[PDB]
């Protein structure tokens, strides 16, 4: 099923990342430039999971390097979390996208539940490799990957969750995706940023 046979029996993140480059677990590898594995080391206490690499990440080979990542950086710094101490990844490892004519970037398309479930063996391998104390789930796709397809981020914001399905039983904190804080009225963007900082601090206080 999905990516499972492409995942090697090792927890070395370098070997896992190289193997993900060869994954064909769903259709998304075809049009993407490369797989984007997570970034960080196995000593990390906090793992953070987004949806997928975007346009910038697809070509950089690293997660959260575009506008959403710069906003995330600002939130982390405000929460006194050192990004180099995190393990940062995504629920799906290949960018799913289209282009619009006259557009200034490739625009992401939402992974189907099928693609999320197909790619989840990589996330499980990352979680068993890193053994985080806490997992921050940035946005609906990542949160649903571990908490179920019906899960609503908006309804559980600053809550420490635990589900028996997850290897290692880390605490789980589901929050807004940083990209959602890029646009909208200023007061709403400012209130939403504060809430993201709060949720990051919940995770770091686990
Ligand atoms: O590492 C990443 C980078 C971007 N994303 C998402 C965030 C946004 O909704 C889109 C585009 O990211 P952006 O940094 O805003 O260009 O992809 C992600 O889920 N994980
Ligand atoms: S998105 Fe995930 S399951 Fe699909 S081909 Fe890429 S690494 Fe494999």
């Amino acid at each position: 099923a999905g990516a499972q046979d492409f995942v090697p029996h090792t927890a070395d993140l370098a070997e896992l990342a190289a193997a993900a480059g060869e994954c064909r677990g769903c259709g998304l590898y075809r049009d993407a430039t490369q797989a984007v594995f997570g970034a960080g080391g196995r000593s990390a206490r906090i793992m953070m999971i987004g949806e997928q690499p975007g346009d910038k990440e697809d070509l950089a080979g690293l997660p959260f390097v575009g506008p959403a990542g710069r906003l995330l950086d600002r939130a982390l710094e405000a929460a006194d979390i050192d990004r180099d101490a995190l393990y940062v990844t995504n629920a799906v490892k290949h960018f799913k996208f289209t282009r619009a004519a006259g557009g200034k970037r490739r625009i992401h398309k939402t992974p189907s539940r099928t693609e999320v479930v197909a790619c989840r063996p990589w996330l499980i391998a990352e979680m068993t490799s890193v053994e985080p104390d806490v997992v921050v789930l940035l946005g609906a796709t990542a949160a649903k990957a571990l908490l179920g397809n019906d899960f609503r981020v908006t309804q559980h914001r600053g809550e420490v969750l635990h589900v028996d399905d997850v290897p290692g039983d880390p605490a789980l904190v589901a929050t807004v995706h940083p990209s959602s804080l890029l646009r909208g009225p200023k007061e709403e963007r400012e209130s939403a940023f504060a809430g993201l900082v709060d949720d990051l601090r919940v995770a770091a206080d686990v």
Side-chain angles (χ1 to χ4, degrees):
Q4 194 60 258
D5 197 50
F6 294 102
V7 179
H9 292 93
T10 176
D12 180 307
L13 290 171
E15 308 298 338
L16 286 167
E22 303 307 331
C23 186
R24 306 184 316 279
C26 76
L28 295 181
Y29 76 96
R30 291 184 178 269
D31 290 354
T33 304
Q34 65 190 318
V36 179
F37 216 68
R42 299 174 61 194
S43 73
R45 174 178 92 270
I46 301 172
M47 178 174 300
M48 306 213 334
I49 310 177
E51 179 175 273
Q52 64 177 302
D55 189 358
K56 316 296 201 186
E57 291 74 26
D58 174 75
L59 287 151
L62 302 166
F64 281 107
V65 295
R70 289 189 290 273
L71 188 142
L72 181 59
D73 281 348
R74 189 165 49 90
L76 291 171
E77 201 280 338
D80 193 52
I81 299 172
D82 176 359
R83 178 170 176 167
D84 296 333
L86 300 179
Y87 185 77
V88 176
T89 194
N90 290 293
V92 164
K93 257 59 167 186
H94 284 106
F95 180 39
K96 186 182 181 173
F97 68 95
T98 185
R99 268 189 206 277
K104 303 157 232 61
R105 69 174 185 291
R106 296 176 297 156
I107 169 179
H108 91 269
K109 293 171 54 187
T110 298
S112 70
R113 181 61 174 185
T114 311
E115 289 157 341
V116 173
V117 172
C119 203
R120 191 168 57 197
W122 293 112
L123 261 198
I124 297 300
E126 287 167 305
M127 289 195 53
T128 66
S129 169
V130 173
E131 289 187 358
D133 290 342
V134 62
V135 180
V136 181
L137 302 160
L138 302 168
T141 295
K144 293 165 196 287
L146 299 186
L147 299 166
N149 200 218
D150 196 42
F151 174 80
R152 313 299 166 93
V153 168
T154 63
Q155 300 183 173
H156 292 284
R157 275 297 301 275
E159 300 170 19
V160 176
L161 314 181
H162 274 94
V163 303
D164 50 19
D165 281 339
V166 170
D169 194 21
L172 310 169
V173 176
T175 192
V176 64
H177 198 298
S179 65
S180 308
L181 315 202
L182 288 173
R183 29 210 301 170
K186 173 72 97 189
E187 205 303 293
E188 274 180 38
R189 287 189 292 106
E190 291 168 339
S191 184
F193 180 87
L196 174 61
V197 174
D198 288 343
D199 295 342
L200 296 174
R201 292 185 301 96
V202 167
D205 281 339
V206 162

